[PDB]
Amino acid sequence: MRLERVLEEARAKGYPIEDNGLGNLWVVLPRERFKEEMAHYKAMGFNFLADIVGLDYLTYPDPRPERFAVVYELVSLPGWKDGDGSRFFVRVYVPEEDPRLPTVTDLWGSANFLEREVYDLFGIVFEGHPDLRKILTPEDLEGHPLRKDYPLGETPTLFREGRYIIPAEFRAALTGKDPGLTFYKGGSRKGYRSLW
Amino acid sequence: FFDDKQDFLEETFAKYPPEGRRAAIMPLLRRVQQEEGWIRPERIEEIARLVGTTPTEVMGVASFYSYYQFVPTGKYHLQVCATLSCKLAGAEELWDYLTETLGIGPGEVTPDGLFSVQKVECLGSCHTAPVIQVNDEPYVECVTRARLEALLAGLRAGKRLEEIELPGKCGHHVHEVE
Amino acid sequence: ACPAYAIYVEPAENDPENPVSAGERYAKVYEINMLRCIFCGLCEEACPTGAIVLGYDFEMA
Amino acid sequence: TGPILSGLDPRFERTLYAHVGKEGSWTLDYYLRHGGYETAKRVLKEKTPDEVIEEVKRSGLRGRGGAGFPTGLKWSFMPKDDGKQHYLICNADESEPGSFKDRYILEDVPHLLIEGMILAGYAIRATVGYIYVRGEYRRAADRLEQAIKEARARGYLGKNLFGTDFSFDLHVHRGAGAYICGEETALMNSLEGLRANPRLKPPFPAQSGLWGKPTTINNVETLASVVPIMERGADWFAQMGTEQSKGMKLYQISGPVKRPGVYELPMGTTFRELIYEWAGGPLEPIQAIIPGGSSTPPLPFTEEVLDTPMSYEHLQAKGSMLGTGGVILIPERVSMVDAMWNLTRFYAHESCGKCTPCREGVAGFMVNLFAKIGTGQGEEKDVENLEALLPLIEGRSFCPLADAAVWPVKGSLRHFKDQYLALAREKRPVPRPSLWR
Amino acid sequence: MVRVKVNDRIVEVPPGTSVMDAVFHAGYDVPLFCSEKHLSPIGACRMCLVRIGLIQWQPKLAASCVTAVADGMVVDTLSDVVREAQAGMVEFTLLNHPLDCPTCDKGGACELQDRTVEYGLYEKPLELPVYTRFEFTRRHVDKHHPLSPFVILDRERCIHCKRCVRYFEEVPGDEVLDFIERGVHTFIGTMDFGLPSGFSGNITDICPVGALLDLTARFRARNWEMEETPTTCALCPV
Amino acid sequence: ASSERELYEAWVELLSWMREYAQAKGVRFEKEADFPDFIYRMERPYDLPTTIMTASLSDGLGEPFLLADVSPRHAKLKRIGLRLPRAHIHLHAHYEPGKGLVTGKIPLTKERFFALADRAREALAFA
Ligand SMILES: NC(=O)C1=CN([C@@H]2O[C@H](COP(=O)(O)OP(=O)(O)OC[C@H]3O[C@@H](n4cnc5c(N)ncnc54)[C@H](O)[C@@H]3O)[C@@H](O)[C@H]2O)C=CC1
Ligand SMILES: Cc1cc2nc3c(=O)[nH]c(=O)nc-3n(C[C@H](O)[C@H](O)[C@H](O)COP(=O)(O)O)c2cc1C
Ligand code: SF4
Ligand code: SF4
Ligand code: SF4
Ligand code: SF4
Ligand code: FES
Ligand code: FES
């Protein structure tokens, strides 16, 4: 139920509403308007902040506005007094030039560790966080390594006669950006959704 | 060959433009076919060489049709009609008798070296079904059980196929049921 | 198919007169790296002839 | 009969087959004493090219070897010379089972043809003609060469024919048997001496053909029929048939029927007149009739079928087509299955291999289906299979052979379905009784 | 220039360029097996059927390669009648084609293979699987026959594309390859022994299936496994 | 039909003639194919007493002059075929209970086959 006043609002305010027919809804908020919007959600009965996913759209094949976008999942915890189950995503585009972004530490306590993680793994400097420090990655590895120009890093598999396999060239599965082995992909292989 | 037969070549090269040379393949092939009763590889190398294109080309053209034979054939290359009209009048049973009399499969030659058997599709002598054509010499029109056995027994005895007598008639361009 | 890159297969052309492989191509080198192995059955499922079929052992070291 | 109307004319006279069956019919001089080359003598020096179009354009003679853009029209598309000598190719290939009409034009009245090609030649500004005669007719090819030697000697072909600057010659060019050469584009390859395949149809013979240069192709009958036309008139012509389908036509017949052969009949004559009056009536009671050619759907033996007028514009509308008028009559001592069985075993022979739909589909799938049904190792399932294959083939091929190979088997499942379902569901082969005379 | 519309996106595309290109230009996608870059279309494989309206849809489905564009034309790739026909032609092509994939050296890069998984599978969401409908005996002919010290030919593999014969006729100008029989028996063969041309080798890449393969590199490591290093020739001044 | 068994024993026979001919005439034998349904067999039982689906006698330079294929185990309308390439000969040996292995109606026997082979050899082969 709680959801609806957000939808009608987004439509009113010119904020796009992306939608998959997969039971997920995203709402695109720009960076400027974020903090106050995110304030309204907490008032509006969305208790519980489940996820913070940093997304890197460096080699995605259809165009995208900005390189990095984070996405929060806010939830209304059903079974509780004002529980409702109104769950929805919020996406927020962030440039590659400036990595700024409003913290939500003062609106959920989930935020504390999670937003730290995304700083570590993707290069996003979170405005006003009580602490940023690297966590999962040691302080001895430069860069925020889960970005997409960064080598996964491979090491030969090794076998008796002096034969090695370099991992990355066995791998036969082809990225959708790639041309494929034959002249061109088409058909099913740019995506196939079996009919219901 | 056509080494000593240069008028025949000159005749067929005159019929077509000097750049339409590949045309010559149809008549030239058919000449080799008749005179030796089949076409062997070397011949095809000459035909090619003459017409100004590689052997491989000429092989492809030659192999297209269904008149030609690239294996040895008997004296009387029997080209039996076996398409609809003829089937309907019982070409089937003719083909049983013929083949079981002579005793050979197709691609084989009768022990005499006088008789090859071979299917073919329609000959356009449907009114006078069934019918066979023996080499390039006109169609043995009709084939009644008598006419067949007569044709064979005569042919073994060295006559021509028009000099072996054959019961009935088979019409000029309309016929009447016997 | 393997997710460790643990199977090294050098193929080779079957001698026509003394077979060791039913088809016409065979395995001149087959080495399998156990230390990298994770234990699957994706191998076994993928080999379309049912050639490689996971065993009954564990007593190795 | 009556004015500009179909049915047997009571004032009719045979024209094209006015000597055929008799002999001395391939003496140039016999032909001459019956007004040989007269019609040419007049036309070349008197009439303009435009008239020899227009006359035929009014006579309304549509195609001749099974359909065809009106003889009159097919001729309009020529450029009328821009440095390219035109060529007239007579398709005297006559495969198409049951057809044998053209045969006799070459054998018995050759000199008729030659004149027709002199007329036609002049109309489309040509100076060379090829006649491509079937690869199994030797008699016809000898008899044709003979006429051309006569005619060539005395200057009825040669240089400066009657005061015009046309010089037009013909050549015989012996085929070698291959039905696919019957299509006009295959033919161009055949003459050019390259393996018989068709070629792309967005150009048409008119703007490029034989060694690139504009060709016009007509069926023998059509070419012969130009001569009466120019002599007697489109006005003489017009009295017959429905409007735009005129002339007489050599309907021919074969299979069981107490007279088989060629009946030079006025157009619009019904099956009844042909089958009973002319062809002497039936033998056994007829199961179905294959109306013209063999690239037509069969039509059941029925009154409403028998009374249908034979024409390209009533048989159009009766859900089949009309090939060369070469009927085959199908008796009930065989089942339809053995008829189409044999027919589609013919097409598999005459598949050329280029097209996917007809290589693998007809000559690879279909033959084997028929064989399975008609040996009785069958399944009901196969008749579902076989039916369902058909729309993938019909639509799409690179050459019109395929569509001719599906239509009979298409047609037999629309009307006669039961017989197929019979032999499958009870699992029994065909009954093949005696038929050898 | 000319307004062509593929499905839902509109494209400009210079006039005199065939439908096929306008399809691929639009981002929609269709098969192909007889055409190739620099060769010449002659529709033959009968794959690349789209439907065409100019508007009014035609009862005949044009083979994209052999029909030009025309102004204001709509061309439809994804349409129910189309998809059906594509399923068809794939299915026919595979009808005779010796099951031999794993041991074929054309590996993960067999143009037939890639088309099949893209477009294939004949009618029926499923609740019971559908696979083959052939159940007669396949074609069987010769295979793995060296034509030359550098080209092995496994004849039976072929789908009778015209690419190689076509190439030979146009490009080196030497004629050394052509089809033999007729109807279904057809197979490419030669009457010249050593395959003599200075450009024999090109057929290895060009042949869509795995009929013409480069003998010098047969059996050494499966196709996908190789590391593919772009570089430049240095053996001659070009 | 139960033809299955009867065809296969004949198929071994057919091969046998080819091996002798090969050493006799100075022409090679070459296996072409093995049954798919043997390679990709993977627990199945087995009946076929050989593994060779297609095999040929070659001139000696890798061009075949004689091809011989049996129908595989599963497929319907089973047959054994012969074919001389470049000369369109397509022969269909069936088996008929009450005769033997027949080319239609004529029995196929060794003498038959050897004669066929030599006419093939002589026209087409360059060895
Ligand atoms: N009588 C026989 O032997 C056979 C009969 N047929 C008939 O023949 C037909 C197929 O013959 P096609 O030549 O493919 O038919 P078509 O549709 O091409 O018309 C026949 C003639 O008209 C010409 N033509 C058509 N449109 C033209 C244009 N726009 N400009 C110039 N010329 C044009 C063709 O070149 C050909 O000479 C079948 O539909 C069937 O009715 C079919 C097979 C054999
Ligand atoms: C596969 C195929 C085969 C053909 N075979 C013949 C044939 O044997 N004889 C014929 O007269 N027309 C045949 N035709 C019809 C041709 O269109 C014909 O040769 C040509 O059109 C004659 O010129 P017309 O259409 O002006 O009469 C065939 C057409 C096709 C598609
Ligand atoms: S079980 Fe096989 S597939 Fe799996 S890691 Fe091991 S070697 Fe690889
Ligand atoms: S439809 Fe058949 S006979 Fe005609 S061109 Fe195609 S493969 Fe050849
Ligand atoms: S061998 Fe290859 S290139 Fe040649 S026709 Fe076949 S598939 Fe095409
Ligand atoms: S060419 Fe392709 S479809 Fe044929 S066996 Fe090889 S991998 Fe398979
Ligand atoms: S079907 Fe036999 S001559 Fe026509
Ligand atoms: S790519 Fe168009 S028919 Fe082949």
Side-chain angles (χ1 to χ4, degrees):
Chain A
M1 183 213 66
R2 298 185 173 287
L3 179 53
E4 300 308 302
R5 315 177 199 149
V6 181
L7 303 170
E8 297 174 355
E9 185 172 299
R11 288 181 284 180
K13 290 191 169 186
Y15 294 142
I17 308 184
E18 311 177 292
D19 277 291
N20 301 1
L22 305 174
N24 287 264
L25 304 89
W26 280 249
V27 176
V28 184
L29 309 173
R31 190 163 44 188
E32 177 191 56
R33 304 305 303 240
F34 182 82
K35 192 52 160 290
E36 48 179 302
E37 277 296 300
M38 201 69 170
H40 309 174
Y41 296 127
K42 175 66 165 185
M44 284 159 175
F46 284 65
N47 317 90
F48 178 47
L49 183 144
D51 192 71
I52 310 187
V53 51
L55 297 174
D56 181 0
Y57 281 91
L58 187 58
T59 61
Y60 205 71
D62 293 309
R64 279 290 177 208
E66 302 302 314
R67 185 187 169 196
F68 302 147
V70 309
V71 200
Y72 303 88
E73 178 175 47
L74 309 178
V75 188
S76 307
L77 204 152
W80 185 231
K81 55 170 175 61
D82 275 338
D84 197 46
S86 283
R87 168 176 285 232
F88 84 122
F89 282 63
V90 172
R91 167 168 294 177
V92 181
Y93 281 76
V94 194
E96 66 305 296
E97 174 71 283
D98 274 299
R100 304 304 302 184
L101 187 71
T103 46
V104 304
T105 54
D106 299 306
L107 293 171
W108 290 275
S110 292
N112 186 33
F113 289 33
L114 292 170
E115 294 188 296
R116 192 169 57 256
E117 188 180 65
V118 176
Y119 154 72
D120 179 51
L121 300 179
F122 294 73
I124 300 186
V125 180
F126 279 78
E127 303 178 301
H129 203 288
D131 30 66
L132 289 179
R133 47 182 181 131
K134 297 167 62 65
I135 38 167
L136 292 177
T137 307
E139 324 84 5
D140 305 72
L141 299 173
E142 297 185 62
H144 304 99
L146 210 76
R147 293 174 294 165
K148 256 169 187 286
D149 50 290
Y150 192 79
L152 163 57
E154 306 300 342
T155 289
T157 309
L158 277 164
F159 301 83
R160 194 158 57 198
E161 317 104 285
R163 312 296 189 149
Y164 46 67
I165 295 166
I166 306 164
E169 313 320 304
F170 248 45
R171 197 166 62 224
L174 304 181
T175 314
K177 184 170 184 299
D178 295 358
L181 274 162
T182 50
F183 315 128
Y184 69 112
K185 299 172 196 299
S188 293
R189 291 194 297 170
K190 287 292 182 60
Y192 159 72
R193 166 192 178 82
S194 297
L195 266 291
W196 273 82
Chain B
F1 285 118
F2 315 89
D3 296 50
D4 58 81
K5 306 184 193 300
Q6 300 188 3
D7 299 309
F8 189 82
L9 262 161
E10 182 61 18
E11 190 196 8
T12 53
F13 269 31
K15 297 190 171 87
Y16 304 125
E19 58 189 66
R21 197 157 281 115
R22 296 115 178 91
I25 295 173
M26 302 306 295
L28 290 168
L29 283 167
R30 205 178 170 122
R31 182 68 277 126
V32 174
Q33 173 57 67
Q34 291 176 68
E35 289 186 4
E36 299 182 354
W38 47 296
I39 312 183
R40 296 116 173 206
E42 48 180 2
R43 317 298 172 190
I44 313 178
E45 307 279 4
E46 275 74 65
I47 289 178
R49 202 159 58 76
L50 289 155
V51 76
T53 52
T54 59
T56 306
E57 167 63 312
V58 185
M59 191 81 173
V61 190
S63 291
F64 192 78
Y65 299 95
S66 290
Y67 169 43
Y68 303 88
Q69 281 292 296
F70 294 80
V71 289
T73 314
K75 178 176 181 293
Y76 301 105
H77 179 40
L78 305 182
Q79 301 174 282
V80 193
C81 198
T83 289
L84 230 178
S85 323
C86 288
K87 188 61 161 56
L88 204 63
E92 176 188 358
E93 299 185 300
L94 179 172
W95 172 259
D96 304 320
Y97 194 85
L98 177 60
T99 308
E100 77 195 304
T101 295
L102 291 165
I104 52 165
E108 299 181 1
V109 187
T110 288
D112 313 319
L114 287 170
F115 295 106
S116 175
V117 297
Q118 152 72 296
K119 281 296 199 68
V120 282
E121 307 301 305
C122 190
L123 296 173
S125 301
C126 295
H127 70 319
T128 47
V131 56
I132 78 175
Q133 193 181 353
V134 185
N135 208 15
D136 70 77
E137 267 293 86
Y139 302 100
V140 181
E141 300 182 307
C142 305
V143 184
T144 304
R145 289 181 172 141
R147 301 185 69 164
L148 180 53
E149 294 155 51
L151 181 58
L152 300 176
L155 290 188
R156 284 199 182 84
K159 297 188 175 64
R160 290 184 47 73
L161 59 159
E162 301 172 287
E163 294 173 353
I164 180 57
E165 68 157 304
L166 297 166
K169 60 184 290 296
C170 275
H172 187 258
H173 66 268
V174 181
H175 176 58
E176 346 300 307
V177 287
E178 288 195 66
Chain C
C2 160
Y5 310 126
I7 304 186
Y8 184 68
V9 192
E10 195 82 298
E13 184 168 14
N14 188 2
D15 300 312
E17 76 311 304
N18 286 309
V20 284
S21 292
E24 52 157 299
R25 181 185 189 136
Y26 79 113
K28 184 183 64 170
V29 189
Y30 204 78
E31 292 183 344
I32 288 190
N33 188 354
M34 297 302 180
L35 297 315
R36 286 285 198 167
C37 196
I38 307 300
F39 296 101
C40 310
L42 286 152
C43 32
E44 178 178 299
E45 283 185 65
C47 170
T49 53
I52 186 162
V53 186
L54 274 42
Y56 292 155
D57 277 303
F58 45 90
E59 303 185 1
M60 37 176 140
Chain D
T1 307
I4 308 191
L5 211 69
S6 293
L8 180 64
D9 297 70
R11 41 127 285 213
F12 198 56
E13 46 193 297
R14 303 185 179 271
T15 303
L16 301 165
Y17 293 75
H19 307 276
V20 182
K22 301 189 279 280
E23 288 206 2
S25 314
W26 45 90
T27 302
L28 172 58
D29 226 57
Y30 182 115
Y31 189 68
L32 182 60
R33 301 175 308 104
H34 300 296
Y37 304 94
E38 181 178 294
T39 313
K41 269 193 278 293
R42 292 190 295 137
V43 168
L44 301 180
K45 51 181 160 57
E46 293 182 299
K47 301 185 178 59
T48 55
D50 298 61
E51 291 179 57
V52 197
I53 333 172
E54 183 55 62
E55 196 60 47
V56 183
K57 195 165 64 178
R58 273 197 283 148
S59 298
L61 173 48
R62 116 205 38 274
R64 272 318 141 153
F69 268 34
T71 21
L73 276 236
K74 249 182 79 78
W75 289 338
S76 294
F77 323 132
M78 302 304 288
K80 288 194 287 302
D81 199 67
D82 290 297
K84 305 185 188 65
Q85 46 180 338
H86 301 156
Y87 286 82
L88 178 64
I89 322 299
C90 170
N91 182 48
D93 186 285
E94 182 163 40
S95 324
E96 196 66 349
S99 306
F100 50 111
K101 58 189 176 65
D102 311 305
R103 186 183 187 189
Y104 296 121
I105 313 184
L106 298 176
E107 290 179 322
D108 305 296
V109 279
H111 307 287
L112 189 52
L113 185 54
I114 299 177
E115 187 180 27
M117 294 188 77
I118 293 166
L119 291 177
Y122 169 89
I124 59 165
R125 308 196 173 214
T127 52
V128 188
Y130 289 110
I131 303 183
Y132 175 90
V133 184
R134 203 193 183 149
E136 310 288 61
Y137 294 162
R138 185 64 191 186
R139 190 161 178 275
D142 293 308
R143 288 266 189 256
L144 221 190
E145 277 191 58
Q146 190 179 7
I148 299 166
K149 296 165 188 176
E150 296 178 292
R152 181 163 294 144
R154 297 173 63 189
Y156 299 115
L157 281 177
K159 302 299 194 301
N160 193 70
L161 299 165
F162 316 154
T164 186
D165 57 7
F166 291 117
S167 299
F168 174 75
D169 293 74
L170 301 166
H171 298 290
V172 184
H173 181 311
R174 302 263 287 127
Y179 166 45
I180 187 56
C181 301
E183 149 133 273
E184 21 75 286
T185 45
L187 183 59
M188 306 152 182
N189 272 46
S190 311
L191 293 179
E192 179 169 353
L194 300 175
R195 65 186 296 120
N197 290 127
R199 63 179 71 184
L200 340 164
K201 251 13 238 309
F204 276 102
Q207 60 166 224
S208 288
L210 183 52
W211 303 301
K213 314 300 209 305
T215 48
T216 303
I217 293 96
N218 295 293
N219 184 256
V220 204
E221 191 182 359
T222 295
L223 290 172
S225 203
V226 177
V227 172
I229 286 173
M230 286 301 297
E231 188 170 307
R232 300 187 165 186
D235 298 283
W236 177 89
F237 204 77
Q239 295 292 126
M240 293 175 288
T242 40
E243 290 64 70
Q244 295 297 302
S245 50
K246 309 190 204 66
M248 37 276 189
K249 181 172 172 184
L250 310 168
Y251 296 82
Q252 15 176 11
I253 201 133
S254 50
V257 55
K258 293 184 171 175
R259 310 187 61 134
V262 177
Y263 286 82
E264 182 167 23
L265 298 187
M267 259 199 79
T269 39
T270 68
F271 286 111
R272 191 152 296 282
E273 296 196 59
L274 178 59
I275 301 179
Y276 288 78
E277 295 192 286
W278 286 112
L283 186 78
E284 287 276 355
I286 298 164
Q287 198 168 60
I289 74 184
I290 295 181
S294 190
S295 302
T296 47
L299 289 168
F301 179 68
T302 345
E303 331 76 58
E304 71 173 63
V305 178
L306 288 166
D307 293 77
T308 305
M310 303 190 290
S311 190
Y312 272 95
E313 47 187 77
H314 293 310
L315 296 172
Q316 181 68 100
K318 215 74 175 187
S320 60
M321 276 76 183
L322 173 72
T324 43
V327 178
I328 303 176
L329 299 165
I330 310 183
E332 39 53 88
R333 287 174 296 199
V334 288
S335 184
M336 289 288 278
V337 190
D338 196 72
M340 264 53 261
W341 181 206
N342 194 265
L343 187 54
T344 57
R345 189 179 72 157
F346 153 93
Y347 278 122
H349 213 275
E350 298 310 305
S351 290
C352 89
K354 195 170 81 75
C355 305
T356 295
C358 137
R359 187 177 83 255
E360 283 174 296
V362 176
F365 211 169
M366 212 134 296
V367 278
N368 298 349
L369 283 167
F370 278 85
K372 187 177 167 67
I373 287 176
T375 295
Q377 287 196 54
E379 311 177 54
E380 196 169 62
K381 206 162 53 54
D382 299 298
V383 192
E384 285 192 359
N385 296 4
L386 180 58
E387 194 148 70
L389 301 180
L390 305 175
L392 302 168
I393 306 171
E394 200 186 70
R396 305 96 191 188
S397 176
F398 179 72
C399 103
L401 186 140
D403 300 10
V406 284
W407 278 344
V409 170
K410 178 77 282 184
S412 192
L413 304 171
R414 294 183 294 167
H415 304 299
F416 301 76
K417 181 90 168 194
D418 287 298
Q419 294 168 52
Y420 292 113
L421 292 176
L423 292 172
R425 73 195 171 73
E426 304 192 310
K427 306 192 190 66
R428 292 166 296 135
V430 286
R432 290 170 168 208
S434 301
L435 285 163
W436 190 9
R437 297 187 292 187
Chain E
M1 284 79 94
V2 297
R3 265 251 186 261
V4 189
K5 189 191 185 204
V6 186
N7 291 165
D8 289 2
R9 299 190 181 98
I10 33 178
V11 294
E12 304 314 290
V13 49
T17 52
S18 291
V19 174
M20 191 173 281
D21 312 313
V23 186
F24 288 127
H25 186 105
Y28 294 86
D29 300 283
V30 67
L32 52 91
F33 279 149
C34 73
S35 185
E36 198 173 86
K37 310 123 187 297
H38 297 288
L39 297 182
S40 285
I42 152 65
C45 76
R46 306 305 300 186
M47 280 307 312
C48 55
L49 292 145
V50 283
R51 199 164 61 163
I52 304 287
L54 168 62
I55 63 179
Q56 169 61 82
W57 299 140
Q58 279 135 264
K60 294 190 181 182
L61 285 71
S64 290
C65 45
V66 74
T67 43
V69 284
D71 207 2
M73 199 159 74
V74 187
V75 177
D76 264 44
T77 297
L78 300 168
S79 286
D80 314 308
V81 212
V82 180
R83 182 58 178 263
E84 188 169 63
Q86 291 166 295
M89 321 315 179
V90 180
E91 190 182 61
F92 281 151
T93 296
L94 291 154
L95 214 75
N96 303 123
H97 193 119
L99 278 63
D100 223 55
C101 294
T103 317
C104 186
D105 194 54
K106 199 70 184 192
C110 150
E111 201 159 32
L112 177 50
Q113 217 173 56
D114 289 64
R115 248 77 278 190
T116 314
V117 60
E118 287 171 62
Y119 292 97
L121 209 77
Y122 202 85
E123 259 304 302
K124 194 163 188 296
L126 297 84
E127 285 73 44
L128 294 170
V130 192
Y131 273 83
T132 47
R133 291 200 296 204
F134 197 65
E135 58 175 55
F136 302 113
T137 300
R138 301 188 152 276
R139 194 195 298 134
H140 287 289
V141 289
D142 163 64
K143 43 207 298 296
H144 50 91
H145 162 29
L147 289 176
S148 179
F150 293 114
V151 183
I152 182 174
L153 178 45
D154 295 66
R155 298 192 168 120
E156 197 178 332
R157 288 180 187 156
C158 199
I159 59 172
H160 314 341
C161 113
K162 288 286 296 302
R163 296 177 169 176
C164 51
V165 180
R166 201 195 302 146
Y167 161 85
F168 271 115
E169 184 171 16
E170 299 178 66
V171 174
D174 260 56
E175 183 61 71
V176 286
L177 213 72
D178 195 277
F179 298 81
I180 297 299
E181 313 252 68
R182 73 164 173 190
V184 277
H185 318 86
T186 50
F187 65 93
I188 61 140
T190 192
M191 286 286 284
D192 280 46
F193 310 132
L195 205 51
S197 180
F199 294 91
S200 57
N202 295 255
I203 65 198
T204 295
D205 297 318
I206 296 166
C207 168
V209 299
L212 290 158
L213 290 151
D214 47 15
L215 180 51
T216 198
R218 191 185 183 197
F219 301 125
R220 303 191 66 186
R222 294 288 284 156
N223 209 265
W224 73 78
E225 292 186 359
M226 306 197 187
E227 181 169 6
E228 314 106 10
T229 307
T231 195
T232 296
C233 190
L235 289 167
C236 116
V238 198
Chain F
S2 55
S3 298
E4 188 187 79
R5 289 272 82 266
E6 319 176 71
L7 282 149
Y8 298 126
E9 324 300 54
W11 173 254
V12 201
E13 184 202 65
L14 224 170
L15 295 176
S16 317
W17 298 336
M18 298 177 72
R19 288 197 178 94
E20 296 156 39
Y21 190 92
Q23 57 183 115
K25 299 304 313 304
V27 293
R28 301 187 296 173
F29 184 50
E30 192 174 7
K31 173 183 75 173
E32 303 303 275
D34 298 66
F35 293 114
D37 58 86
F38 178 54
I39 316 190
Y40 304 119
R41 166 272 182 182
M42 47 171 74
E43 47 66 54
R44 315 178 66 104
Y46 205 51
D47 312 309
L48 313 176
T50 185
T51 56
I52 305 183
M53 177 174 48
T54 306
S56 290
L57 298 157
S58 299
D59 70 322
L61 302 174
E63 285 187 66
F65 55 76
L66 192 282
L67 267 154
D69 72 293
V70 62
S71 52
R73 208 171 71 220
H74 294 296
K76 308 287 176 57
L77 301 179
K78 35 177 59 60
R79 51 168 178 72
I80 305 177
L82 297 170
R83 45 174 288 126
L84 286 65
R86 302 178 282 177
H88 41 53
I89 303 294
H90 212 182
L91 298 182
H92 292 37
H94 298 270
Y95 185 85
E96 282 190 67
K99 276 195 176 179
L101 189 72
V102 289
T103 299
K105 45 187 57 55
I106 307 179
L108 176 54
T109 40
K110 186 171 179 175
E111 324 158 303
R112 198 155 176 274
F113 183 76
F114 282 180
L116 197 73
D118 278 300
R119 296 185 189 88
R121 186 184 187 277
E122 276 296 294
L124 300 161
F126 298 130

